[PDB]
Ligand binder design. Sequence first.
Ligand SMILES: [Cl-]
Ligand SMILES: [Cl-]
Ligand SMILES: [Cl-]
Ligand SMILES: [Cl-]
Ligand SMILES: [Cl-]
Ligand SMILES: [Cl-]
Lengths: 176, 176
Amino acid sequence: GMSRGHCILAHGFESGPDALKVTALAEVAERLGWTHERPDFTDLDARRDLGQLGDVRGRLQRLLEIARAATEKGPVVLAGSSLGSYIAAQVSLQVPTRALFLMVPPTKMGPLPALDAAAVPISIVHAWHDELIPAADVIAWAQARSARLLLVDDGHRLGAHVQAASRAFAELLQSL
Amino acid sequence: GMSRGHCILAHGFESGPDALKVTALAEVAERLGWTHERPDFTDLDARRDLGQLGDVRGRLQRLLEIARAATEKGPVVLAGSSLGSYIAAQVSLQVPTRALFLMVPPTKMGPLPALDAAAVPISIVHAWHDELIPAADVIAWAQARSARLLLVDDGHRLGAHVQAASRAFAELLQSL
Ligand SMILES: [Cl-]
Ligand SMILES: [Cl-]
Ligand SMILES: [Cl-]
Ligand SMILES: [Cl-]
Ligand SMILES: [Cl-]
Ligand SMILES: [Cl-]
């Protein structure tokens, strides 16, 4: 449509739609003229009966439905943090996605499929000191796809790099 | 006039002080209110009798002298491209350096010391497809000191990523 497009920002495991990093990314989308939404996956994450990271299939299906709806109105950018990145990437494989912004993406997901993504612009922010997702794993995944990769001196939460991550997202949106 | 501080920008092999990438860094410095200078090392680079990359020891000494002069006004920012990055890093160990910005830094330099730098804020932009300086080499160097590292889909000359590199430099300067 008239609008340059819509950003769907997916929070990490046991986080929620008002968490710091997705809220920061929503402010970037706002300031850059994109519409945006932060879906709530907290119910799904609480479903331990379906796995140690909850109902991940449910997360994937919920995001797929939301993205599909959005693509029937105009371009869609998917972004996330950690588990949110994993599902954004997987969903890009199922809906036409303009670009993908991934904070601390896990490359492995137990018995679920390994991280993959559509062959569209990908920008990643990862922590050198991530205790959960070794930096080498994200470096290898990004290298295979020549995805833009920003490594910062932080751990998995990226708690000291919310502005750096916001700027990387802005740079991605400004390129589209 | 008033300034935020001073930057010394060191050009790559043979490219000179008007070269595309150090010119872009000078643009950023100027826009953000920093003073800047771009020394000419082309006479030293022309000394093929002394090395495939010319007289790199002479290059080091010339930058050292320039940086000593600039630090009469306080800690200086040192930035470079390619061969200029290698000398900026090495000089940082010998003068008070506020920050180091390195594009496609050589990690080895034949009989000269391996790449090293002072314990200052460091921001690196490297190319995934750098045929001269494998990305793995720069990743290992940056990891060891938690240097901020941006990896882009390009080769050594960064012909398609001058804007991304410029933005990374701006981000470094704005953080000081
Ligand atoms: Cl939102
Ligand atoms: Cl950093
Ligand atoms: Cl240059
Ligand atoms: Cl030679
Ligand atoms: Cl890139
Ligand atoms: Cl500034």
